[PDB]
């Protein structure tokens, strides 16, 4: 997260960190009990590894009772993931058994109903990301308020030229925005899950290539099937 | 509504008024884009007439752009749903047709995880019920925060003496509370609906009876079946 401020300790109870052999990779964001979801570029760059979900946690190098570590036994894509549509998909990632709930490990709900959230509406976006861009990684959680930014000036050839789909939406990246790292991780709007960071190899900071994170209510019927 | 006052206009799209032969009778939650959440008792137990239910609405009298009248299909209440208890107190009203959507008109995420409110846990009810013991009515929607109250001190012979089962909740009703013509209204907690103000005949605003209200949580499932 770029030009954001450390989160409270953890008041984002849905937050995880998606980590490769003890590393925090991505973001993901808890949705049922043995349900971690998040983006499926960050699985494919998963070097050659042990893929772990980190919960509860704030600090991630510092013990914390509520910190819990959890194997994934599959990664469950949707039915028109493909090579070329992978920087802006989605991953369900189910968990060795069922997460130990309480005050810092808590799902978060979604979206059910296929409608655009309104621009303008602020939106926060949470993350252990990038905080500039030389690269400095954060210990603490970080996050910030991020306005939607509706998807016809998203789509003008001077921002991402028609990339945005009705899957997709943008949030203004005008120096406040996500980053490398934050990618798999929660774009909440009014207490809901609205969308997931799917940033890819994109710039951070600019304003003129919004932030992009794919929208869950439009894979609603699917995420409903696969936690059924 | 007492202790409470009157709501932002249209700042809860999802807030919609059961009515009975052209007059408000029970409170009510839009949950789908064709599906409004009530109380089975609150329908069940009136008089007869024609049903509909007003969505978009602030002022029950005044004329307003956003405001519309839906004729009801059918009515689902819960199976286990019986005149001689409080349990199970859900009902499923389907509109004529899809519900316009839009700033002032949108249906609210539900809980779906099982779990139990953190007590202590500040939470929103709205309604257009009673106002004082004299049993007025308000025109416009009046709202008030209520903080959650943990079962075991609800359960208590000088509360509610063993009636709060696993699938209630209460929250604290010290002068401020929801009250006649509150049933079947919302209690949303951090922007997510939790519970459905439960019919019964109940003092209101004293804290020694805590209001009830019904866990949606513990019903996902049939909620699920009956929207499917």
New interface residues.
């Given amino acids: 997260i770029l030009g954001g401020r450390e989160a409270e300790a953890h008041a984002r109870p849905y937050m995880a960190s998606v980590q490769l052999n003890g590393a925090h990779l991505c973001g993901g964001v808890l949705v049922?009990?043995q349900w971690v979801l998040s983006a499926a570029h960050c699985l494919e760059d998963a070097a050659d590894g042990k893929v772990q979900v980190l919960l509860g946690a704030h600090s991630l190098s510092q013990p914390e009772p509520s910190k819990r570590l959890y194997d994934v036994l599959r990664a469950v894509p949707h039915p028109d993931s493909q090579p070329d549509t992978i920087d802006h998909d989605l991953l369900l990632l189910q968990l060795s058994e069922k997460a130990t709930?309480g005050?810092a490990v808590?799902?978060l709900?979604?979206?059910?109903?296929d409608?655009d959230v309104?621009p303008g509406t602020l939106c926060d976006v949470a993350g252990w990301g990038i905080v500039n861009h030389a690269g400095r990684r954060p210990d603490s959680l970080q996050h910030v308020l991020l306005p939607v930014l509706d998807r016809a000036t998203c789509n003008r050839r001077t921002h991402h030229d028609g990339a945005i789909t009705e899957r997709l939406m943008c949030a203004e990246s005008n120096r406040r925005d996500s980053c490398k790292g934050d990618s798999g991780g929660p774009l909440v709007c009014?207490?809901?899950l609205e969308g997931v960071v799917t940033s890819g190899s994109r710039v951070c900071g600019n304003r003129k290539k919004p932030g992009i994170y794919t929208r869950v209510a439009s894979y609603a019927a699917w995420i409903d099937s696969v936690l059924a």
């Avoid at 709900?109 to 109903?113: D, M, N, S």
Wanted: proline share 19%; no cysteine; net charge positive.
């Fill in positions: 049922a009990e709930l005050p808590r799902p709900p979604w979206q059910r109903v409608r309104a009014g207490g809901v």
